[PDB]
């Protein structure tokens, strides 16, 4: 006998996120829950998961990453819920 | 008998995040929950889980990572709920 | 008999972040919860879990990671939940 | 009988941060929770968890480390939830 | 028969962080919770856990860390609610 409430009764404009869960019982991943409420900003990867033997042999290899750039970023209210409230991003 | 009860009575517009998680009963990983609320800002890997044996006989490799750079990043309220509140980002 | 609550009766605009787990009973994980609210700003990794035997024989490597640039980071309210306040971010 | 009464009864907006947990009963890790409010900002890790044997003979090799530049971060309220206050950034 | 009973009635207003665990009953970690609330700044690490066997035989190694750098971290109320306050960060 499982029993799970969750915002049973609500009155009056609330503004929520709400994740519920549940549950009754090279790479490997079997069972998981993943990246839910999530946010990637400006994010890199250069060499991931190269197949089996890669560059075996008598390789010669030169990497350079050159991240260098004028690169603006402005946010307001990131995963930030909000009720009776003023939110504004104002330039000059 | 398991019995959960959250946020059961609510009345006058809070700002929430709920997360409500009931369980009853190279890289490997069999179960799990990961990054429900999980923000990521400017994040970088450059070398992960090369395939096995990589490089293996021989290798002249010359690695140069150089992050330089006028970047800016401006962020209000990150992960933040808020009710009967100002947020602003004023520039000049 | 297990029971749990949780903000069972709320009134007036609370500003909340909730997390709330019942639970009743190279690299490897089983079973575990990870990262619920957790943020990354400006993270690096460089060479991580690499293969099997990488490198195995006469290698000859020159590794340079160069962190070095003139970024900014402004952040207000970081994981801080508020009511009834005013947060801002002026420049000039 | 296990019972647990978090925060029953709440009148008057309050900010708060809540983290319940019930439970009754190379690198390997079995159960655990891990980083449930958790802020890393400007980590590093060069060398992480390389595979077995990795430059196992005859191995040549010159790492260089370089955190240099002109980096700059400006927070207020990191994990600090607040109410009827006044937070603010401000730059000249 | 166990009871815990945390912040049963509250009003007011109050800014609170609450952390409530309740629990009846190379590297290797079997159960535990880590970094509930945990804040890492400029934190480093070069060489962890490496794979093995490494540099087993032979080995001519150079290894050079250099933190040498302008950084500047200008942090106000780290981990510490408040109510009915004034935080600010003011610059010239």
Same mark, same amino acid.
């Given at each position: 006998?499982?029993? *799970? !409430?969750?915002?049973?009764?609500?009155?009056?404009?609330?503004? &929520? #996120? *709400?994740?519920?869960?549940?549950?009754?019982?090279?790479?490997?991943?079997?069972?998981? %829950?993943?990246?839910? /409420? !999530? *946010?990637?900003?400006?994010? !890199?990867? /250069?060499? !991931?998961?190269?197949? &089996?033997?890669?560059?075996?042999?008598? @390789?010669?290899?030169?990497? +350079?990453?050159?991240?260098?750039?004028?690169?603006?970023? +402005?946010? @307001? @209210?990131?995963?930030?819920? /909000?009720? /009776?409230?003023? +939110?504004?991003? %104002? +330039? #000059?």
């Amino acid at each position: 006998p499982l029993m *799970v !409430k969750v915002l049973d009764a609500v009155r009056g404009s609330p503004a &929520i #996120n *709400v994740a519920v869960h549940v549950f009754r019982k090279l790479t490997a991943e079997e069972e998981f %829950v993943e990246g839910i /409420y !999530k *946010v990637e900003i400006d994010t !890199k990867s /250069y060499w !991931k998961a190269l197949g &089996i033997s890669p560059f075996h042999e008598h @390789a010669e290899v030169v990497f +350079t990453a050159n991240d260098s750039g004028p690169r603006r970023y +402005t946010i @307001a @209210a990131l995963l930030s819920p /909000y009720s /009776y409230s003023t +939110t504004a991003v %104002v +330039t #000059n």
